[PDB]
Amino acid sequence: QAVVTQESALTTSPGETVTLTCRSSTGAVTTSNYANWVQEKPDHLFTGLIGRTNNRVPGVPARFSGSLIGDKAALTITGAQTEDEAIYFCALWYSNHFIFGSGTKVTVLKRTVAAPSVFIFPPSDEQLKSGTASVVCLLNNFYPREAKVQWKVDNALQSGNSQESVTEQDSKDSTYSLSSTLTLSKADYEKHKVYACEVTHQGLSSPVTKSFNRG
Amino acid sequence: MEVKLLQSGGGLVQPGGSLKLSCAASGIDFSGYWMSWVRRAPGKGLEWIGEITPDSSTINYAPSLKDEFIISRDNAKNTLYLQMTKVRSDDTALYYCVSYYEGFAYWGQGTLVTVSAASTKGPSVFPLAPTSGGTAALGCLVKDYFPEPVTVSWNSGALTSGVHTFPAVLQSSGLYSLSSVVTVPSSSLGTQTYICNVNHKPSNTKVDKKVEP
């Protein structure tokens, strides 16, 4: 029952400075919280960067530094490199246990922004013949990674009934693709008529909506 | 000497069962190191499980997990142990042992623990039937299978470019669902046949499915 909070995501260009913050729900973050910073690169490669607020793990480059800014813990990456693109987790010490924060996705721009191509797929008639309907929305070849998918049935926003998946960064394109599935009972699916996927990404100046009607 | 924390243990375990994970240290004086266990679950982040001092005088746990895990070590065997008891779905994750050097300094390769009462089930494979600027998108939905993994190919491997097989998601039913997608010229929608070849080895299931407009 302590929550450590961080920025969802941060975007930078190679050579600029990134500042990540780490907040405690109890109150101010002090040196008695011994803020720890851990990095996760793709394929679950974890690296310890900082421990005890300020102490670097030996051999970690000095361009990573830990500090306190006001009532929070902070990791600063000065001159962030393409190599530093990763998820950064902070852990705060609370007397007898560590709590990790939810992590921050730091992007180091290696290419131009690419708007996703958005496609929508209605349930197959085969899957309908069983008691389930799944509508799939595909966001194809977009950069950077940050994207939002909203599902809407007859103009109504949905919740708790969708799950999404993302590919790893493409070898060639540096892009991502995303697949979101909305699952309904064949009855729930046949009760309403219009199924809509709303996509927000930085390469789209306004949200894109892909929609189909039943039949 | 190159350092290495070699982990062993893990796998699929039924709700309420118990597991023991081992972490053998190589290349350091294991005897003078604080050791710790953390875990990484799909929708969650890193979660700290606990730590133990080199002499085992002190063993600290996360309050929410202290009645489920037991950390121990045998310095003569250079090994650290994590004992899991009465496990539940939320314990599904990759578990890591870490060596403290001013921070989480040294890490093991990770051990996957999957907690589920689900039975082996082959997937059902539904089409994702097809358009953007002469480009069309089609695919297959590989739904309701257990356990992981699944493999997906297109046209027996002859089709590869423009292919994205996505990570599976775990549904509330306890079964996995996965999607595989390909973009192609829409020219081709009527002069090429597209088939996805799905292999779920755990259940000896192989299904070929044609995607048509």
Partner: peptide, 10 residues
């Protein structure tokens, strides 16, 4: 009694 490597917290 040998040393102890510095822990991630104090």
């Amino acid at each position: 009694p040998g040393s102890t490597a510095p822990p991630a917290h104090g």
